[PDB]
Amino acid sequence: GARASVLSGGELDKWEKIRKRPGGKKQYKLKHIVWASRELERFAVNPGLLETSEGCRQILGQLQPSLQTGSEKLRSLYNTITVLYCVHQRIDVKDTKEALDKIEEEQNKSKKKAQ
Amino acid sequence: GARASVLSGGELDKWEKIRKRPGGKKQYKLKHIVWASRELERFAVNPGLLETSEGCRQILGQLQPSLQTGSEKLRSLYNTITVLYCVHQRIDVKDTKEALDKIEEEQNKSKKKAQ
Amino acid sequence: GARASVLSGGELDKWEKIRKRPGGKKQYKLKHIVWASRELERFAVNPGLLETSEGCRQILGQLQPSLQTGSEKLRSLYNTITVLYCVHQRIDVKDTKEALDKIEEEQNKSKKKAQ
Amino acid sequence: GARASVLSGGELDKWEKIRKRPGGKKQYKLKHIVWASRELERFAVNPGLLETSEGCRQILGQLQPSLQTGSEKLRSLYNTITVLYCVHQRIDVKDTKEALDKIEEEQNKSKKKAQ
Amino acid sequence: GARASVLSGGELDKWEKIRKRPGGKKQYKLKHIVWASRELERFAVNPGLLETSEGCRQILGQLQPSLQTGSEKLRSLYNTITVLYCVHQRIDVKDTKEALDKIEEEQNKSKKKAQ
Ligand SMILES: *C(=O)CCCCCCCCCCCCC
Ligand SMILES: *C(=O)CCCCCCCCCCCCC
Ligand SMILES: *C(=O)CCCCCCCCCCCCC
Ligand SMILES: *C(=O)CCCCCCCCCCCCC
Ligand SMILES: *C(=O)CCCCCCCCCCCCC
């Protein structure tokens, strides 16, 4: 059943199409997904949350006060999970800037009805 | 990313613990997802819809008028798709009969707000 | 009682005396029923529906929407189910057209009491 | 009858100039027509309807109930028949996208008889 | 798509059952279609008009006010087009006279709606 993720136009096929910068050439690779698990394990957060959008969103919500002064690894991890949230929301983001704008669109859409 | 799904509590931890026959000593295995994938391909239906609860539920909606007249293979597929729906919904069902109770429970629940 | 499978003047004796095409001199065989089971098995329908009128009505209801554009084999199965219905009701019909007229007349009577 | 279908200036001559993508490298070939006739007999649809526009439209209707959750091959078959319908209607489409627009675009006139 | 015309029950198969004489024995043949194409080229007439009823109707309309003077060949062409017209409406006529009546018969209703 996990095979759905490797079908043409599925989530792992969609992931390695996404560009790092909005006009750049180098792409996102799946190695960043594996890398994320060990960082979550280090700080004692459950990697099982990266299975769905709803799980990814809990991680993204947690790190919001830390993020502003965060290291380059922490900000990059936040951007890496941001893309997993966008991919799990079925959004065909072409790059990081779009994924970040898509999160602001998701947060604006979410927050407006949840004050 | 499919590592997350096999961590305990994930979808492919839950899938293989569920009983086939309520007093039976046999449980559902991954072999029945490939069998469902073959039978859906034989019916010219997309097996990628098995990723999600809504895609499984759409397949359950599609095959419902054919169940009254359905074969052992069709009823067995309906039960296979039903358990995948229960797994995607994170419902801790122990067997086929609990999974069937949940579809009937959800359908009667659904009827009340569909009027 | 398997002895009833050779019943003289029964339904099986009549089956072999019913004409396939209405002016044609050639009759229905029991291997047609075996072929009908195999065609039903491909479309995932339960063969036991052949054995009762209650199942035959459901088969016809499911075949009718596809009849008009359906292939000759679909039409011949429709006619085969129609004759089995006439046989289960114990309606003597000499041929396929006679069976079709009797079943449409019985169905027409049913649809006046179906609302 | 319609032997004109394989002559210069005819339906095939036009068929093989229709592109897959507006400026695309590949075009449609005659052998898709032969394959489609074989596929229809598997579903048990009559292969004699294919020489007529309204028979082709009726076949497209018949393919709809599994199209929506349908496999890639079923969608490809439907779109290929759709382009052929446009060819039988003597519509000189530029490409695959136009054949898709023509179905909705022609139906807009007649769908205003149902508003 | 053209195979349908040669599959049993198709338009060529219907063509070939039609009598050349009202209560006759001899019928129309594929080699008459070849002959008809040869007669058309002699007067520089497009064959693509004999694909449909409307094209045939237009040719009959051109032929009609010249028939009184016409040769046995002109009458034969008129009869032949008329038979094709009836075939293209898919009317299983027994003979050439019936096909001719169908044209005058359409005029009894159509010309009365033309004024
Ligand atoms: C999701 O698609 C299931 C994960 C796969 C485990 C291996 C399956 C091997 C199947 C072999 C064929 C069994 C007969 C249907
Ligand atoms: C996402 O996590 C990428 C993972 C790439 C390696 C997968 C290795 C196999 C994981 C499933 C093992 C299941 C054992 C029962
Ligand atoms: C009598 O013993 C009751 C149980 C009957 C079981 C089924 C017997 C089927 C015999 C052959 C039927 C052939 C019909 C074409
Ligand atoms: C009526 O005029 C029908 C023609 C149908 C003939 C079908 C069999 C021969 C194949 C014809 C097409 C070949 C294209 C390469
Ligand atoms: C509508 O039905 C179009 C039918 C086209 C028939 C084409 C048949 C081609 C046969 C090729 C045989 C091999 C030649 C090397």
Author numbering:
A (entry chain c), B (entry chain f), C (entry chain g), D (entry chain e), E (entry chain F): 1 to 115
Copy out sentences from the published article reporting this entry, exactly as the authors wrote them.
During virus assembly, a primary role of the MA domain is to bring Gag to the inner leaflet (IL) of the plasma membrane via its covalently attached N-terminal myristate group and highly basic region (HBR). The MA HBR promotes Gag membrane binding by engaging in electrostatic interactions with the IL of the plasma membrane. The HIV-1 MA protein forms trimers that assemble into a hexameric lattice with central cavities at points of sixfold symmetry on PS- and PI(4,5)P2-enriched membranes. During HIV-1 maturation, the MA lattice undergoes structural rearrangement, with mature virions displaying a more regular hexameric lattice and smaller central hexameric apertures compared to their immature counterparts.
Here, we examine maturation of an MA triple mutant, L20K/E73K/A82T, which, despite replicating similarly to wild-type (WT) in some cell lines, exhibits distinct biochemical behaviors that suggest altered MA-MA interactions. Cryo–electron tomography with subtomogram averaging reveals that, although the MA lattice in immature L20K/E73K/A82T virions closely resembles that of the WT, mature L20K/E73K/A82T virions lack a detectable MA lattice. In addition to the significant density loss in the center of the L20K/E73K/A82T MA trimer, there was an unpaired density gain at the C terminus of L20K/E73K/A82T MA pointing to the CA layer (blue arrow), suggesting that this region is likely less flexible than the WT counterpart. Additionally, the electrostatic potential on the surface of MA facing the membrane is also more positive than the WT, due to the L/K and E/K changes in the L20K/E73K/A82T mutant. But more intriguingly, in L20K/E73K/A82T mutant VLPs, the intersection points became concentrated at the threefold axis, and the registration between the MA trimer and the CA trimer is much stronger than WT. This is consistent with the observation of a more ordered MA C terminus in the L20K/E73K/A82T mutant MA compared to the WT. In the L20K/E73K/A82T mutant MA, however, E73 is substituted with K73, which forms salt-bridges with E39 and E41 and transiently with other lipid headgroups but does not contribute to Na+ ion coordination. As a result, interactions at the trimer centers in mutant MA are only mediated by salt bridges with R42, making them less stable compared to WT MA. In the immature L20K/E73K/A82T mutant, the absence of central density, coupled with upward reorientation of R42 in the AlphaFold2 prediction, as well as the E73K mutation, is presumed to enhance interactions with lipid headgroups, consistent with the role of R42 in phospholipid binding. The collective structural modifications induced by L20K and E73K and the repositioning of R42 create a highly positive surface for phospholipid binding and docking, offering an explanation for the increased Gag binding affinity observed for the L20K/E73K/A82T mutant.
